Amino acid sequence: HLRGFANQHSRVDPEELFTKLDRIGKGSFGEVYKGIDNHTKEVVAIKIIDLEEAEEIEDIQQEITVLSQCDSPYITRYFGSYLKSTKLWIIMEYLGGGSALDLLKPGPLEETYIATILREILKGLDYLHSERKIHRDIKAANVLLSEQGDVKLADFGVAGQLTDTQIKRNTFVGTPFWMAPEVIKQSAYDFKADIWSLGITAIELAKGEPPNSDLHPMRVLFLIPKNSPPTLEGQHSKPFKEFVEACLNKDPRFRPTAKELLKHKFITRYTKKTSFLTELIDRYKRWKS
Numbered sequence: 001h002l003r004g005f006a007n008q009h010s011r012v013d014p015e016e017l018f019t020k021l022d023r024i025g026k027g028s029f030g031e032v033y034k035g036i037d038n039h040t041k042e043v044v045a046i047k048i049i050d051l052e053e054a055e056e057i058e059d060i061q062q063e064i065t066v067l068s069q070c071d072s073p074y075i076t077r078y079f080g081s082y083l084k085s086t087k088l089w090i091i092m093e094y095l096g097g098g099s100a101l102d103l104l105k106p107g108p109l110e111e112t113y114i115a116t117i118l119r120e121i122l123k124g125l126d127y128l129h130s131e132r133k134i135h136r137d138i139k140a141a142n143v144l145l146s147e148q149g150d151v152k153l154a155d156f157g158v159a160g161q162l163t164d165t166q167i168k169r170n171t172f173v174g175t176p177f178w179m180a181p182e183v184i185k186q187s188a189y190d191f192k193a194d195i196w197s198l199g200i201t202a203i204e205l206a207k208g209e210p211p212n213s214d215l216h217p218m219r220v221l222f223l224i225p226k227n228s229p230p231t232l233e234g235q236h237s238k239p240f241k242e243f244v245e246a247c248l249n250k251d252p253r254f255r256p257t258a259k260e261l262l263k264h265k266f267i268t269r270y271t272k273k274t275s276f277l278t279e280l281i282d283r284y285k286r287w288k289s
């Protein structure tokens with residue numbers, strides 16, 4: 001019956017207030033478009049969700065709630081939501097540099113870039129975890145950059161909320177290659193699931209693809225809780241291999257917090273400013289052009 005659902009959104013037709021432009025990517029329940037707020041003229045990202053198609057409605061509601069409860073320069077900003085029949089327009093912050101996955105397209109990343117990106121992801125994780133929120137879908141595709149090199153976490157479509165009522169989660173959610181073993185087994189889990197997913201993302205930043213990409217997603221789901229954790233192989237520095245090993249511990253009790261990882265040798269070795277990442281944005285622009 002969706003009682004109280006429409007009350008939370010502006011019933012004003014979003015085509016009058018916003019000018020919809022080109023598609024820039026996709027989200028958990030819809031397509032992401034570039035837009036301009038007709039009043040301020042300011043650039044925005046618009047996510048259009050078909051409620052009849054994604055009828056997943058509890059999760060759409062979860063993403064709305066999560067985004068409106070976050071207030072951090074490390075989390076994509078939310079500007080409201082507009083309903084137009086079965087379509088829901090979610091207006092968010094515009095990040096012109098695209099994703100960390102988009103940025104791997106022209107070629108491999110030097111270690112200096114990887115350490116800077118991981119440091120900024122950790123600042124985002126530290127904020128979420130302090131707010132008792134778990135992202136649950138940490139991967140390069142969900143790490144976005146502004147045209148100035150600011151790194152932000154996006155896509156709260158499967159995000160979890162811990163309380164004094166619910167100390168742990170048990171929901172089976174995420175993308176197979178990046179999923180923590182306790183998530184797959186549906187054991188009671190917390191913020192430590194994002195730490196494991198960050199370790200998979202660290203390998204993905206170094207290799208362009210997560211570990212065991214040569215395997216079928218369903219085979220990987222069956223093997224993650226049974227096999228030894230992945231390792232960073234090949235020509236990479238010892239502190240980088242150590243950072244990955246710290247994240248990829250099968251026992252969550254031994255995985256460090258985001259705050260601890262911000263003190264890791266791999267993260268502290270390089271002291272690049274986020275503006276350093278604009279070179280990757282320029283490289284991607286030259287490659288696409």
Ligand SMILES: CCN(CC)CCNC(=O)c1c(C)[nH]c(/C=C2\C(=O)Nc3ccc(Cl)cc32)c1C
Pocket residue numbers: 024025026027028032045076092093094095096097098099102144154155
């Ligand atoms: C088809 C995608 N294409 C690569 C071939 C373009 C690369 N991506 C972008 O240009 C891009 C841009 C400029 N902005 C975004 C995504 C945004 C974005 O800008 N804000 C935002 C908020 C929430 C979510 Cl889930 C996603 C986004 C994206 C994916």
